[PDB]
Design a protein around this ligand. Structure first.
Ligand SMILES: *[C@](O)(C(=O)NCC1CC1)[C@H](C[C@@H]1CCNC1=O)NC(=O)[C@@H]1[C@@H]2[C@H](CN1C(=O)[C@@H](NC(=O)NC(C)(C)C)C(C)(C)C)C2(C)C
Ligand SMILES: *[C@](O)(C(=O)NCC1CC1)[C@H](C[C@@H]1CCNC1=O)NC(=O)[C@@H]1[C@@H]2[C@H](CN1C(=O)[C@@H](NC(=O)NC(C)(C)C)C(C)(C)C)C2(C)C
Lengths: 306, 306
């Protein structure tokens, strides 16, 4: 037993991180086969950041302007192209440590592991969720652009995030690995605000099921509720609407614990209306929303990865 | 910015995990050079667990009774010996992925990353602290024995924990990599209780400094306190005594933020005496004690590892 904010083992991604240096700018890139992916604002300078035209900026670049370092080994760039907000550097050497991989654009509410990197060297790994407002509450310092977020499924790394920027509220915005930002953000220093966030209701319910699996039941009650009546209380507390489709996803957890999804909604309703009154759930004094139903089942049943 | 419960990149350890199978028992082992380390109760059976004599049990074993699998490759055991509560299996092949490493026995209050494993395959990675009562609040299912905890320093993996067992309160107990249990625990199914835990005061103070570094200052106050007067309030709230030596460790954090260690103690005192009154710190509604002063400095300044 026990329940922890668990990240995927990071080794498969560690072997893909490289340093990309152009001009006075150094950041991380992701080396898969013979391509290095990195944020396109690596071609920017101290006065470019304000309103750069990256098409113009990139046509002025030569391959040899791109210094790619894989450890103590310098990769030669033999081509470059821009795809949305990512730069793709064709190099003469295919990464021999390239895992089986996919690029995936995730939905808000889904979680992933972030391998935080500086100068192509991993610093740490942690679990994030894509917030409903398409920010992530990460831990990112200057140097960390190009660090990627990912999930692993048996043996395949599904890359879903690459870090680009920090918003004035201390949260983070980035792209999928095809360079499309999550949310309305652009890689420009212009006024941008995160948008009002909301709590991921289906994930809170998953975590409540995690709690029950793990012996916390103080929050359960004999009541039930309708999905309509639940969503009328959720709206009030700035929780995402729960859909029948969320209900069906919570099925297996509902089945393992013997608590109907709608009964767990009645518990969450009372938790929203009364607070926790000085009690904790799974070592938290807040309702936790960065575990998906899949995360809970993974950790409470022990799925591995090769 | 941002602050997350960050684990070390796990790749260096992933390459060392193997499956050790003896009799009806399968668990994880740690393959470094030509030795596989694993919990000695791998030699136990369904009725051995009650009061086994592992010396007697092990002399009855042959090398060929030990099935060690490194992926799709079966390691041949050419010797075995018991060191405290760990078994050391000499194998004919040295792990080519053996990192630079050390075995270290940590002090309560220190943190580490746990690479949770089943059948020699990594499941996830998370950050733990050694509690003052020498348990760890982990996430461990059946199959997870032999998973290790570790820290990394530049390029060296310092192994400090190997998982053995779960206590009836849902917490976990294990050994260092030389087989010595942390705390009064034994690898026997006899009555054992964790001992009363306490909060790691110096770590809470570190995390408060993390908060200030990251823009949370609502909890600060103009007051100060003496170490004596602080420790009189700490005792009351079942916090560890703060020593002058803890104070000196908190120096660099005190210097970077401009808040004297004793002033942050006055803040913590008021937080203990008044609660947080519906406010959060670093996304927590509890005082967090599983970040060391070093953890905070690592994450707030961006140290990496090669
Ligand atoms: C990233 O480019 C990086 O790691 N680069 C290393 C090169 C500089 C040596 C950084 C990572 C952020 C820094 C702090 N936390 C981070 O996640 N990203 C940036 O520097 C981006 C790039 C220009 C500005 N920027 C920012 O994140 C900045 N925020 C910002 O301007 N945001 C709004 C929404 C436009 C207001 C800031 C944090 C440096 C002020 C790009 C956006 C092109
Ligand atoms: C470990 O041996 C393992 O992973 N083995 C895989 C082999 C069995 C297929 C497990 C890991 C624990 C199981 C659940 N969570 C865990 O961390 N450890 C054990 O099974 C140990 C070994 C015997 C009993 N045991 C326990 O953890 C048990 N606890 C217990 O008996 N504790 C007290 C303090 C003695 C009461 C229990 C959880 C299975 C009941 C050993 C202690 C020899």
């Amino acid at each position: 037993s026990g329940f922890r904010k668990m990240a995927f083992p990071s080794g498969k991604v560690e072997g893909c991180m490289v340093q990309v240096t152009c001009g006075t700018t150094t950041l991380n890139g992701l080396w898969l086969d013979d391509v290095v992916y990195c944020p396109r604002h690596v071609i920017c300078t101290s006065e470019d950041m304000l309103n750069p035209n990256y098409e113009d900026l990139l046509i002025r670049k030569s391959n040899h302007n791109f210094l790619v370092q894989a450890g103590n080994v310098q990769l030669r760039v033999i081509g470059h192209s821009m795809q949305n907000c990512v730069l793709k550097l064709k190099v003469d050497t295919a990464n021999p440590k390239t895992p089986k991989y996919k690029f995936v654009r995730i939905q808000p509410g889904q979680t992933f592991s972030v391998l935080a990197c500086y100068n192509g060297s991993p610093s740490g790994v942690y679990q994030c969720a894509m917030r409903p407002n398409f920010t992530i509450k990460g831990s990112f310092l200057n140097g960390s652009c190009g660090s990627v977020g990912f999930n692993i499924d048996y043996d395949c790394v599904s890359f879903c995030y690459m870090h680009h920027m920090e918003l004035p509220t201390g949260v983070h915005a980035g792209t999928d690995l095809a360079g499309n930002f999550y949310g309305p953000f652009v890689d420009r220093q212009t006024a941008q605000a995160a948008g009002t966030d909301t709590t991921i209701t289906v994930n809170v319910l998953a975590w409540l099921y995690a709690a029950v699996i793990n012996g916390d039941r103080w929050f359960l009650n004999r009541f039930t509720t309708t999905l309509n009546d639940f969503n009328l209380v959720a709206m009030k507390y700035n929780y995402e609407p729960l859909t029948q489709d969320h209900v069906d996803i919570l099925g297996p957890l509902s089945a393992q614990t013997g608590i109907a999804v709608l009964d767990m909604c009645a518990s969450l309703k009372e938790l929203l209306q009364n607070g926790m009154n000085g009690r904790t759930i799974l070592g938290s004094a807040l309702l936790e929303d960065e575990f998906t139903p899949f995360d809970v089942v993974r950790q409470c049943s022990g799925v591995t990865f090769q």
